[PDB]
Amino acid sequence: AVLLLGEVTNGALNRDATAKAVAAVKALGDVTVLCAGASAKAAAEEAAKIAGVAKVLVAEDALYGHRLAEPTAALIVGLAGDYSHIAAPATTDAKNVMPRVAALLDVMVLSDVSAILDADTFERPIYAGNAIQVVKSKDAKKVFTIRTASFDAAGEGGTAPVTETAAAADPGLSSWVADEVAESDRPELTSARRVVSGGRGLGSKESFAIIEELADKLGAAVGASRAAVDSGYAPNDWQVGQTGKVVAPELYVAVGISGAIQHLAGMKDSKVIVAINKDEEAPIFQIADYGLVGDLFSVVPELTGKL
């Protein structure tokens, strides 16, 4: 069987991630999604409606509010006994709890699996994506995170399986203090089909708006490089790369980004990459399917106008 950690946030299930995960793992047995949180009920519902989810477990309890690694990891382990595969989408929530879980069961962890060759052979990108390693876990239980950006979010029409309820356990080692949420009113980066990212070439937070205009025009999500975030042009939440989010939309327009290895790591798998830089030698122009060498302050607004 396979226990899968549902990616729920403010009582709202992130269907795209959970879908892609179920889609990736369904070929291993009966997928059973676990929704734990302070408001996991509604999520549980949406979880059940996904094509492939054999059943849904719910753990709605204040103890799981924000899914603190200590309480949550205790939950999963307590249930691990009936599953040989425990997985989840490679999200921060999953990256925080999964390794802890694995250690508790005294088993390794497979991070960012891009391909499941079978019940124990997996594929994962190493060296900031410059190499793909095929590993074989000799472990009794395969604990791992799914690199959602390499699968398709299959679902929407499901068999609406069962929705039970679970227990608890609380090692009082942590508490949530506060949250600083970033206003994102456009396609969430990881799910977007089109992404327009801004780098340092933009010069200011003001000029980043021309990136946003083009994005809206294309109904795309906005991405960013370290430079842009460090200089305050945009929130770190929009960072694409080995440290941030790794996306793979149909269209990825990189304007004002040199194409550093660390940035490519999160977008070299995009279908079509377009680059507009003023430096004809920037590394980005060696991976970009279609590149244009010019001033982003003259090209982007012209591109936006002929769209």
Partner 1 sequence: MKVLVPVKRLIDYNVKARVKSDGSGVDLANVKMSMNPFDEIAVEEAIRLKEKGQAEEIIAVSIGVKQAAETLRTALAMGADRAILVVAADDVQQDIEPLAVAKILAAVARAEGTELIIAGKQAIDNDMNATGQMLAAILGWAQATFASKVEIEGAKAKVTREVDGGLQTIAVSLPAVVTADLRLNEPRYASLPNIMKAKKKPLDEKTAADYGVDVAPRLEVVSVREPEGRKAGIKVGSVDELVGKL
Write out the residues near ligand FAD by the rule CB under 6 A. 199-201, 225-228, 239, 241-244, 256-258, 260, 262-263, 266, 277-279, 282, 295-297
Distance CA 279, CA 288 (A): 14
Q: Does 103 bind partner 1 (CB under 8 A)?
A: yes
Largest interatomic CA distance in the chain: 60
Give residue 225's identity as a one-letter amino acid code. Answer: S
3-state helix/strand/coil string of 19-78 = HHHHHHHHHHCCEEEEEEECCCHHHHHHHHCCCCEEEEEEEECHHHCCCCHHHHHHHHHH
Which part of the chain contacts partner 1 (CB under 8 A), choosing from 29-37, 158-166, 179-187, 191-199?
179-187
Q: 32 or 150, CB closer to partner 1?
A: 150
Whether the CB-CB separation of 218 and 243 falls below 8 Å is answered with: no
Shortest distance (Å) from residue 258 CB to partner 1: 12
Distance CA 172, CA 105 (A): 20
Whether the CB-CB separation of 199 and 225 falls below 8 Å is answered with: yes
54 binds, among partner 1, ligand FAD, none (CB under 5 to 8 A by kind): none
286 binds, among partner 1, ligand FAD, none (CB under 5 to 8 A by kind): partner 1
Positions 153 through 172 that interact with partner 1 (CB under 8 A): 171-172
Other beta carbons within 10 Å of 259: 22
Unique residue bearing structure tokens 């396609």: 187
176 binds, among partner 1, ligand FAD, none (CB under 5 to 8 A by kind): partner 1
Whether the CB-CB separation of 86 and 2 falls below 8 Å is answered with: yes
Q: 105 or 168, CB closer to partner 1?
A: 105
Distance CA 259, CA 204 (A): 19
Shortest distance (Å) from residue 174 CB to partner 1: 5
The answer to the question of whether 127 is labelled as a binding residue is no
Name the residue number minimizing CB distance to ligand FAD.
241
Q: Contacting partner 1 (CB under 8 A), which of 1, 38, 55, 100?
A: 100
55 binds, among partner 1, ligand FAD, none (CB under 5 to 8 A by kind): none
Q: 49 or 200, CB closer to partner 1?
A: 200
Positions 109 through 128 that interact with partner 1 (CB under 8 A): 109-112, 121, 125-128
Q: Does 9 bind partner 1 (CB under 8 A)?
A: yes
Q: What is the DSSP letter of 10?
A: S
245 binds, among ligand FAD, partner 1, none (CB under 5 to 8 A by kind): partner 1
Shortest distance (Å) from residue 263 CB to ligand FAD: 4
Whether the CB-CB separation of 224 and 190 falls below 8 Å is answered with: no
Expressed in angstroms, the distance from the first to the final Cα of the chain is 49
| Annotated binding-site ranges for FAD | 251-279
